[PDB]
Design a protein around this ligand. Structure first.
Ligand SMILES: CC(C)CCC[C@@H](C)CCC[C@@H](C)CCC[C@@H](C)CCOC[C@@H](CO)OCC[C@H](C)CCC[C@H](C)CCC[C@H](C)CCCC(C)C
Ligand SMILES: CC(C)CCC[C@@H](C)CCC[C@@H](C)CCC[C@@H](C)CCOC[C@@H](CO)OCC[C@H](C)CCC[C@H](C)CCC[C@H](C)CCCC(C)C
Ligand SMILES: CC(C)CCC[C@@H](C)CCC[C@@H](C)CCC[C@@H](C)CCOC[C@@H](CO)OCC[C@H](C)CCC[C@H](C)CCC[C@H](C)CCCC(C)C
Ligand SMILES: CC(C)CCC[C@@H](C)CCC[C@@H](C)CCC[C@@H](C)CCOC[C@@H](CO)OCC[C@H](C)CCC[C@H](C)CCC[C@H](C)CCCC(C)C
Ligand SMILES: CC(C)CCC[C@@H](C)CCC[C@@H](C)CCC[C@@H](C)CCOC[C@@H](CO)OCC[C@H](C)CCC[C@H](C)CCC[C@H](C)CCCC(C)C
Ligand SMILES: CC(C)CCC[C@@H](C)CCC[C@@H](C)CCC[C@@H](C)CCOC[C@@H](CO)OCC[C@H](C)CCC[C@H](C)CCC[C@H](C)CCCC(C)C
Ligand SMILES: CC(C)CCC[C@@H](C)CCC[C@@H](C)CCC[C@@H](C)CCO[C@@H](CO)COCC[C@@H](C)CCC[C@H](C)CCC[C@@H](C)CCCC(C)C
Ligand SMILES: CC(C)CCC[C@@H](C)CCC[C@@H](C)CCC[C@@H](C)CCO[C@@H](CO)COCC[C@@H](C)CCC[C@H](C)CCC[C@@H](C)CCCC(C)C
Ligand SMILES: CC(C)CCC[C@@H](C)CCC[C@@H](C)CCC[C@@H](C)CCO[C@@H](CO)COCC[C@@H](C)CCC[C@H](C)CCC[C@@H](C)CCCC(C)C
Ligand SMILES: CC(C)CCC[C@@H](C)CCC[C@H](C)CCC[C@@H](C)CCO[C@@H](CO)COCC[C@H](C)CCC[C@@H](C)CCC[C@@H](C)CCCC(C)C
Ligand SMILES: CC(C)CCC[C@@H](C)CCC[C@H](C)CCC[C@@H](C)CCO[C@@H](CO)COCC[C@H](C)CCC[C@@H](C)CCC[C@@H](C)CCCC(C)C
Ligand SMILES: CC(C)CCC[C@@H](C)CCC[C@H](C)CCC[C@@H](C)CCO[C@@H](CO)COCC[C@H](C)CCC[C@@H](C)CCC[C@@H](C)CCCC(C)C
Ligand SMILES: *C/C=C(C)/C=C/C=C(C)/C=C/C1=C(C)CCCC1(C)C
Ligand SMILES: *C/C=C(C)/C=C/C=C(C)/C=C/C1=C(C)CCCC1(C)C
Ligand SMILES: *C/C=C(C)/C=C/C=C(C)/C=C/C1=C(C)CCCC1(C)C
Lengths: 230, 230, 230
């Protein structure tokens, strides 16, 4: 309770934990192989986030980085979360549209570059260089957003309407929520330091629960996750 | 030789190295694609363990963690081993039964959570919180054990008898040996400290060689690893 | 500019960045799923290397390792690069020949052992033991080279001539360039220290740009990356 942001770390831990349990229960019983892949992906995402929220809450996932002459509290565990959960979210989208394997590779690899350069920026001790990593990471994010909108152009032919509809909704959820993360980091504790860590943590908690549990609720309620069967 | 547990680290290095060489030789010549996947998986497992045993033996894979007011010797290299070798062992089981891809994802991701939360527990400086990570990791292990027993329920129909027989044996080997690891950690150097590090290292060496080389000997001697062919 | 090797780190950053941009543009428009996988793999390789070259240039990817009684500058970011880019290069080769999945596993796992034991050697504080890790890593490299020459022996039957021709060329490029890396490390800053870090950095920059951008130019100009189509 000693860090003011504890309350949002606690709330994020609880909501990710409850979302995980909900999705775990919800997928109990499903047999359809296509649906099993979406439940597995979609349940792992908040499970991983639960563990990394808890590590921040307990202090394990926090480190001090000197930059600006100051000792700056940097929650590194966010990058260990996102390293796994953001490619998993992209895989859910990619599987929905039956993406080609080359496209999945491009997406997962650009996402790794996005998170790994964000982690390097988050831990860089020369203040000005932190924003160079932010820019490179943002370029990788823009590439991902580009592929999500313009990289499935051969798939439209042979896409079930309900898959098309659930994919468009989740793609729009993804583009809006993910695009807010570079802005929060830029103005927050890792970047310019104009928004305090307390509020930054709240913002990422709202984004994360929305991008993982809210995304997952929309996907897992959809018929698009089942193969078409008589 | 300065740490009493060196002898078990040396013995573990040698047995993993010899098991690797044996499996490498044994799979020389196999053409069958199914069998090649099992030899590859099963040979990599003790090869990786050989390197991490050697890193503990040479001291690289040891760190001191303050907790309990004391400086506690924690062999972190075990988690770098298990991060790769325990999903590989699960993949051998999963391939045997032709598991659905969603099930393999669930298994590999729960296993990553199990090892990563065990690593966080192993390095946590607040003593009481180490057991919170142990509990979460144990929950993930129990999920894996649950899936190995109740998650292949559509596969029984179309399973060759020899695959069914080798899978049941290896599944039983896996459930018994893996379940001992949380107990050893709980009573050993990472947990309550009731069993000294010397004996703990012996116990994990016996478990590891059994779970990797003993498992691999049973699998690789089986006809279940070959596709059925005239 | 304070470290004499900065100029090769700068040149390597620029050439990897320009190679990435070139391959990104070059693959704009390709529809063929086979070709998309090769463009994705082959574009990610210099993109990742660009980020790790930049991290060395900016100092983030450098650490000091005590060994020999001295504080030795070790660029660890090379291992974070190679951890991802060397399996990706192997995947390009493997996909060219339609390798069996067991063979791809063997290659990617031996490559992980090669890079992870090279990283352990690079950070080991007992000088003599650094060469033990070098030897183990070299054994893994020799295994990979062995598989590239003798592990596709069932694939020769059903291999298009242009795939066979591009694969032989890239395989020869790979064996020659990769084999130089253990020699550079052995005589350079990480090993015996007979070649200064400045020259070592130049050597790895020439190898890396050749093994990534030069390799990629040969592959991506080939018809072998397209499925055979009327
Ligand atoms: C967390 C617990 C419920 C585990 C402990 C219980 C044990 C066994 C009993 C539960 C068991 C009956 C599970 C029932 C579900 C069935 C199949 C489950 O999963 C379905 C899919 C694919 O269809 O993958 C879904 C993928 C999933 C991945 C599993 C990860 C989990 C691991 C534990 C830590 C997490 C965090 C949640 C904490 C909260 C509090
Ligand atoms: C959860 C999500 C929806 C997040 C989406 C991303 C997003 C763009 C981030 C917005 C964060 C913001 C609301 C938080 C405000 C912090 C702030 C009030 C700090 C207060 O305390 C200190 C002061 C000076 O006294 O600094 C003052 C700080 C300021 C400079 C605050 C700047 C915020 C903006 C000017 C709002 C931009 C408009 C957007 C909605 C873009 C569309
Ligand atoms: C360790 C050495 C034998 C390597 C050095 C030798 C070189 C080349 C000569 C050996 C060569 C003829 C290998 C013969 C086997 C053939 C094909 C091998 O592998 C078969 C399968 C799939 O069928 O994958 C199997 C997957 C396997 C993965 C390879 C990992 C190894 C890498 C080296 C370090 C290890 C640790 C063992 C140390 C002991 C001492
Ligand atoms: C290789 C594997 C098969 C491992 C399987 C997992 C397993 C449950 C772990 C057992 C480990 C155990 C045999 C090691 C004993 C350590 C011990 C003798 C320490 C000696 O020295 C100090 C003392 C006090 O003087 O502490 C005293 C320490 C004690 C409290 C020891 C506690 C051990 C048990 C009471 C045995 C439980 C029974 C099981 C076989 C479960 C079935
Ligand atoms: C680097 C920039 C061009 C990104 C910013 C731009 C944004 C959107 C505009 C560009 C956009 C029109 C891309 C056009 C290409 C199309 C499809 C691209 O990719 C094709 C394949 C599979 O066929 O994967 C190919 C796999 C590839 C992986 C993408 C990784 C990149 C990420 C950014 C950092 C890098 C480093 C390069 C820096 C230099 C300077
Ligand atoms: C980019 C690539 C092609 C690299 C391929 C791998 C390769 C084998 C590495 C060669 C590196 C080499 C040319 C660099 C030379 C460093 C060197 C001149 C150092 C100079 O300064 C200090 C001195 C003493 O005054 O040490 C003296 C240092 C010496 C002992 C230098 C040793 C180099 C050799 C004797 C050359 C071997 C022949 C090969 C071409 C193998 C075929
Ligand atoms: C899915 C859910 C039930 C998760 C609920 C949210 C939760 C994890 C975080 C909320 C913290 C909350 C209790 C706030 C008040 C603090 C308080 C207790 C007293 C203050 O008092 C103080 C004074 O400084 C702090 O106490 C010590 C530390 C604790 C407060 C933190 C404990 C860790 C957690 C509560 C989480 C435990 C994880 C488990 C789910 C493990 C089981 C795994 C498995 C079976 C799948
Ligand atoms: C597959 C096998 C042959 C492995 C055999 C077991 C072994 C790796 C560990 C046993 C240690 C043992 C010799 C005990 C006595 C110590 C002693 C030498 C003297 C004591 O004297 C002392 C005094 O404190 C310590 O010596 C210095 C360190 C060494 C003892 C340790 C050296 C490392 C290893 C012996 C392993 C080397 C790895 C290789 C396989 C590399 C090749 C890779 C490739 C070709 C695939
Ligand atoms: C693809 C290319 C355009 C890459 C070009 C090469 C380059 C990255 C490295 C060359 C350094 C060079 C300018 C040498 C002179 C130094 C100098 C400026 C003055 C010396 O003056 C000094 C005194 O000590 C140092 O300056 C401070 C640091 C900088 C010199 C380094 C800045 C980082 C880089 C220049 C790279 C930026 C990365 C971007 C591509 C981000 C955008 C991502 C996205 C849109 C895809
Ligand atoms: C968020 C992101 C930036 C992260 C992206 C990925 C990331 C984790 C990068 C990792 C690269 C690298 C380790 C960097 C080190 C930095 C540093 C300063 C020191 C680190 O930290 C230290 C300091 O004490 C220890 O590291 C050395 C040991 C290793 C970390 C573990 C060794 C592993 C092996 C030798 C075993 C072989 C593994 C394989 C077989 C894997 C293949 C799987 C297969 C079987 C299919
Ligand atoms: C046992 C477990 C807990 C481990 C589970 C996974 C694990 C390794 C978690 C890693 C997350 C994270 C790095 C945590 C950092 C903690 C910390 C305090 C600081 C670390 O350690 C430090 C301290 O000096 C350095 O880290 C920063 C640099 C990075 C480690 C490496 C950067 C990688 C990239 C920028 C390149 C892009 C990579 C991708 C392209 C990968 C995608 C593959 C593709 C091409 C298909
Ligand atoms: C170049 C090579 C040697 C590297 C090869 C791989 C490598 C990165 C090895 C990593 C092992 C290990 C982390 C070693 C730690 C060393 C040390 C001294 C301390 C480190 O560094 C520290 C010091 O502060 C922090 O580490 C602990 C936290 C973790 C690093 C991150 C935890 C991750 C999780 C708990 C979440 C679960 C992840 C999974 C779900 C992944 C599965 C994917 C799925 C969903 C499909
Ligand atoms: C589950 C959490 C999700 C969906 C997180 C998304 C994170 C991002 C899109 C992060 C992007 C970043 C940048 C583009 C620039 C650097 C800072 C980051 C890593 C916050
Ligand atoms: C090759 C080595 C094998 C099979 C290792 C298995 C390791 C485990 C099943 C570890 C489990 C753990 C817990 C469930 C709780 C926390 C402590 C661990 C990581 C030892
Ligand atoms: C893109 C960069 C490439 C192709 C790098 C290749 C790196 C190697 C083949 C590294 C090999 C090493 C050894 C065999 C011994 C230990 C030192 C290393 C890691 C340099």
């Amino acid at each position: 309770t000693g860090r003011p942001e504890w309350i949002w770390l606690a709330l994020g831990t609880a909501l990710m934990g409850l979302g995980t349990l909900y999705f775990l229960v919800k997928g109990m019983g499903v047999s359809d192989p296509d649906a099993k892949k979406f439940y597995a992906i979609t349940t792992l995402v908040p499970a991983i986030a639960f563990t990394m929220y808890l590590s921040m809450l307990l202090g394990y996932g926090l480190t001090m980085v000197p930059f600006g002459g100051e000792q700056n509290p940097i929650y590194w565990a966010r990058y260990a979360d996102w390293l796994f959960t953001t490619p998993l979210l992209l895989l859910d989208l990619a599987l929905l549209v039956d993406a080609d394997q080359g496209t999945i590779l491009a997406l997962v690899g650009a996402d790794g570059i996005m998170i790994g350069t964000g982690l390097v920026g988050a831990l860089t001790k020369v203040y000005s260089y932190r924003f160079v990593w932010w820019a490179i990471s943002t370029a990788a994010m823009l590439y991902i957003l580009y592929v999500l909108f313009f990289g499935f152009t051969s798939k439209a032919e042979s896409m079930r309407p309900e898959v098309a509809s659930t994919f468009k909704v989740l793609r729009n959820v993804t583009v809006v929520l993910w695009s807010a993360y570079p802005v929060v980091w830029l103005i927050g504790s890792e970047g310019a330091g104009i928004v305090p860590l307390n509020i930054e943590t709240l913002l990422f908690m709202v984004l994360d629960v929305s991008a993982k549990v809210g995304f997952g609720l929309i996907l897992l309620r959809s018929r698009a996750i089942f193969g078409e069967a008589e």
